Design a protein around this ligand. Structure first.
Ligand SMILES: [Mg+2]
Lengths: 101, 50, 50, 50, 151, 333, 101, 50, 333, 50
């Protein structure tokens, strides 16, 4: 079980320790470098990432329309947003506030 | 020791004992693999030919 | 050492030490590849950046 | 007269392939390198201890 | 956690070597402006007068030699001030200075604020005379990149 | 990088001037050689493996010879001063979401169709002054644009106070509210930055941008929030990476065309240009024509590169040696 | 506290982590902490010699190392050549309740 | 005009007009050919098996 | 140049020695860091892409630490003094052919079974003295050996005038005996030369030699005409081509093992050793033992190289910074 | 309106094969770099002249 959680925590929450010169920065017990490669969340957050303080529909609709007008066709602009339970209520309050206007 | 022409790149190499991954990489027997089916096309909406 | 509780082998033909203990060792290699990171869009709260 | 030999390889050299940037050679008993098409590094370690 | 990780497939490799692939991109460019000079070589400031009065020659410096002999190139305002190049580039280091003109029937020139640093120029076409025309225009190439991963 | 050529371009590095052939001892030396009847000019240079010469320039057949400084080959990093539109509202409206878009245009590939959009946002509140807005939106832009996770440097952003008015205080993604303590911030400056450079494989290329504003509801209409003006640049990318990629290309003319292709077996050409120094560039552009019916010309150019110390000491001594030896009036720069 | 890649010590009220393990703070994978030995004990407290993983040249902030920060286990990365033993497993126990008449 | 991954050592390259062998080798489209039938064994009278 | 390892070996170029982590600003900086309890030693250094620390050396688990000067690692070139055998005849006997066979032993191949021979011949005359013999012998040797279009140089030939007796008179293939005017020559010095070198691909190697003499008919007796003794060496091959190969190998234990292989698809490592500069080497050899049953040692070493100018300034300051931090007693060269 | 284009190649490019260390691409009319597999250089020149 503990070896199963090691495999899954490395596939998502993995962080690379190599320089831009090519050198690794952490060495093992035998002195050879620990060659760690990144995971799902580290390799994918190096582009297209927004760090917001408060969420608004004016932010996300503009973030997803300047993206889609530049890169996607007309019939290709379907965005399935993966989120949590609290992010759905935060989504719900903004499209309530937009429709109430 | 020496060269057989004007342009010889390598000299002969030798070592003793424990071989590591750079012992093979300094004798040119360790190369990255080309993943040919993996290919990235950068995403854009191309408005030439329009 | 003498016995192996991980397998149930009482007695040892090839002893590692004399302590009368048992150690298990496991290893694995793994990897993940993300081809294009410009094709995933993320909005993260600012308290999670650091 | 009694004699001995030893040679340690790392564990990761079990199925270590050689990428063949240069040819991989094998020292013979006569004192001549001969080129070899064996892809495994353990094929060349097992010749040298013999 | 694994139900998240089981939405991603598995791709199977032969060894624990670094692997690489090809990243392919795009080709339709334009070139920014460095500075513009009139026919006696004075750099055109923003408060200057018009530069191409009476189809007078003047100069455009670019960070690279992307343009050709007879091509019409246009700035931010496309087709309002079309500039037809006159002669090949004189390479001032890594800086191609083209002697240009003003087509379109333009008599009173191009304003000086249309010839500043950061003004982008793209290629329209290369128009020639009907009788005894000499060769103009040229042909351009591009090349891709690569990326890499480990274990 | 790969440059265009007028049928050839060859480069020689002028690390020193020796004035005769017998003084060529260290590499990188140059001697402008000519005869008394000024019909032939050439440059004897000491390569890393022996004395080498150039093509023999016919001095009746030069087309131009003009030398450029190191201040004319430096890319100026473009600035944008982002302020509040006083016609819209001098102070921030206490309810609205204030969003700023940065429209990048040469993200990872060459075209103007490979775009990238980054954002900063401030929810404006009651009693928030115009200075506390810029303290809060330079923090929001820095967490998006100067983060530690991004693959490339995108912009450098700064705050300018009203007391100092010229000095930049840099705001990073690790900068807190308690570090920026001034009540007289009047603008936000978004400046271009220098991209990474690998010798001969990744050229010097820049990502341009445009700060764009979203619309806030002021009275009943959605007015665009701000105005962004191009400020005159204060930071330049030096000349070293352009010339080191210019030696590397023009060295293949006189040498091996494959630089490392297939690596057990390469011919390691040793280069003499330091990528961390600024250089002056002199271009003699000439041709060849014979005394026959073959009167067409074969255009050629020879580049000479010398270090610039700020007063152009090495290049003007190189120019002056060519002027006496060859009788050409190359202009002192 | 972890400028360059410098060792520093993390004090926990129990021995729950093992040698060679990556442990994370509240900002989990931004600052991954690698255990550089065994937990030398101080009463019930177990102090851990720790260096930072990733390409973390800047260090770990002093407000990310205060009393109350919730740490968890990630994995134990090891080198490709001449690797040595790392990691450990953990166990638990239940409780009971009664009633009367 | 930047980098998409950490280890992107190539940038997109471009030029105009007349193309040289120098222009083709700098975009990595020229490489020396290997004469596989040509192999040289260094001449000696080997006496290691003697 | 592949070397042997006991286990993994790491090298760190010490181009400048600082006193804090914060002072590390240029590629090549170093600082030895330790505790105030002296139980752990590591080397923080500035890589060409940021700050990088070394492994943590347990100061109880060190085996040896020794510092090697530059002149210990400088190869002394082998000299051979060829004279006429005084027992045979101190003057050349007339009409005899004086042939000399230089026996090279590690010519291009790697063994003693790959051999090569270069000859020199002089047929003596009626009035030929000893000095006129050594003149024509060295003209004939340099004509065969040091032709310009050979593959590699093999040995250098030097006459010695008996009046000078300590200054080498260089004899090449372009040398005529009109240039060699001295009348008192007493020996011919044959001295091996430094082979070419490419970092990583071609190691530093030498082709040794012995001069051998064919017999002449002196008084009806076939006697070999000369003797060849080995005089003390007067030249040294400097340390720089040995340490740059020591860095090219030890930058795959930290960095990339694939150096160049799929050529544009590589990481390129920046090497901080100038190959035309001498260095001093410090080898701190240490090990690791596990907790309870993992008592096998992982015996490894951390190499440090510092450029030194005559008197070893940069290494003795490096050792003095290590000795006050670690509590060690590394001796100062 | 009368227009003109011109491109010049050396005579060394008659049968010039491309040893693709990176893949050789074609510029499309749409603006997309498409990967191509023809190894002759004049196949790519005739694409861009048209
Ligand atoms: Mg992303």
């Amino acid at each position: 079980l503990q070896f199963d959680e090691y495999k899954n925590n490395a596939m998502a929450w993995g962080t690379s320790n190599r320089n831009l010169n090519g050198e690794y920065m952490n060495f093992g017990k035998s002195g050879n470098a620990i060659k760690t490669g990144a995971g799902i969340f580290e390799q994918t957050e190096v582009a297209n990432t927004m760090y917001y303080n408060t969420f608004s529909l004016k932010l996300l609709e503009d973030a997803l329309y300047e993206l889609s007008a530049s890169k996607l066709a007309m019939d290709d602009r379907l965005f399935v947003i993966k989120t949590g339970e609290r992010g759905a209520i935060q989504f719900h309050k903004e499209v309530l506030k937009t429709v109430s206007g | 020791a020496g060269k057989l022409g004007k342009f010889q790149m390598l000299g002969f190499q030798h070592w003793k004992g424990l071989t590591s991954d750079n012992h093979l990489g300094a004798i040119f027997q360790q190369a990255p693999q080309k993943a040919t089916n993996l290919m990235v096309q950068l995403l854009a909406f191309y408005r030439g030919k329009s | 050492g003498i016995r192996n509780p991980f397998t149930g082998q009482k007695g040892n033909p090839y002893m590692s030490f004399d302590e009368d203990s048992a150690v298990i060792h496991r290893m694995a290699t793994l990897g993940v590849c993300v081809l294009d990171p410009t094709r995933t869009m993320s909005l993260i709260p600012a308290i999670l950046q650091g | 007269t009694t004699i001995r030999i030893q040679h340690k390889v790392a564990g990761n050299k079990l199925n270590k392939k050689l990428a063949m940037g240069i040819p991989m050679v094998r020292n013979l008993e006569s004192g001549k390198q001969v080129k070899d098409t064996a892809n495994m590094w353990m094929h060349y370690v097992d010749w040298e201890v013999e | 956690l694994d139900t998240f990780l089981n939405s991603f497939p598995t791709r199977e490799f032969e060894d624990d070597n670094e692997y690489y692939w090809d990243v392919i991109g795009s080709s339709r460019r334009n070139i920014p402006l460095v500075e513009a000079r009139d026919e006696n070589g004075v750099v055109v400031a923003a408060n200057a007068a018009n530069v191409g009065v009476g189809t007078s020659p003047f100069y455009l410096v670019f960070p690279e030699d992307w343009f050709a002999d007879g091509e019409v190139i246009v700035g931010n305002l496309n087709q309002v001030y079309p500039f037809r190049i006159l002669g090949d580039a004189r390479m001032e280091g890594t800086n191609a200075v083209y002697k240009v003109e003003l087509m379109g029937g333009n008599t009173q020139g191009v304003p000086a604020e249309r010839l500043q640093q950061g003004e982008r120029f793209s290629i329209e076409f290369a128009p020639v005379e009907k009788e005894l025309s000499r060769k103009v225009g040229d042909v351009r190439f591009t090349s891709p990149v690569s990326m890499r991963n480990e274990w | 990088m790969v440059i265009s050529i007028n049928q050839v371009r060859q480069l020689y590095v002028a690390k020193a001037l020796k004035a005769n052939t017998a003084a060529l001892t260290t590499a990188g030396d140059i001697v402008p050689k000519a005869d008394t009847a000024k019909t032939t000019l050439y440059f004897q240079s000491m390569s890393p493996a022996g004395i080498v010469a150039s093509d023999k320039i016919n001095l009746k057949h030069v087309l131009y010879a003009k030398a450029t400084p190191s201040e004319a080959l430096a890319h100026k990093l473009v600035r944008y001063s982002v302020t509040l539109d006083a016609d819209v509202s001098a102070t921030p409206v206490a309810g609205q979401n204030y969003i700023l878009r940065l429209a990048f245009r040469q993200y990872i590939g060459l075209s103007e169709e490979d775009q990238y959009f980054k954002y900063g946002e401030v929810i404006a509140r009651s009693g928030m002054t115009a200075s506390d807005f810029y303290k809060k939106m330079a923090i929001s832009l820095a967490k998006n644009l100067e983060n530690k996770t991004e693959s490339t440097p995108l912009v450098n952003i700064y705050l300018i106070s009203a007391a100092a008015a010229s000095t930049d205080v840099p705001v990073t993604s690790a900068t807190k509210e308690s570090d920026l303590t001034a009540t007289d911030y009047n603008q936000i400056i978004i400046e271009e930055t220098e991209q990474p450079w690998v010798l001969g494989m990744m050229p010097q290329a820049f990502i341009p941008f445009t700060p764009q504003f979203l619309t806030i509801t002021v009275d009943g209409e959605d007015r665009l929030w701000g105005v962004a003006t191009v400020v005159t640049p204060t930071k330049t990318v030096p000349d070293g990476h352009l010339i080191a990629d210019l030696e590397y290309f023009c060295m293949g003319a006189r040498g091996d065309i494959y630089r490392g292709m297939g690596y057990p077996n390469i011919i390691k050409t040793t280069y003499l240009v330091d990528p961390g120094a600024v250089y002056d560039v002199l271009d003699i552009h000439y041709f060849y024509t014979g005394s026959n019916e073959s009167v067409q010309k074969s255009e050629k150019t020879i580049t000479l590169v010398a270090v610039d110390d700020g007063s152009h000491t090495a290049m003007n001594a190189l120019i002056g040696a060519i002027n006496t030896a060859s009788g050409l009036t190359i202009a002192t720069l």
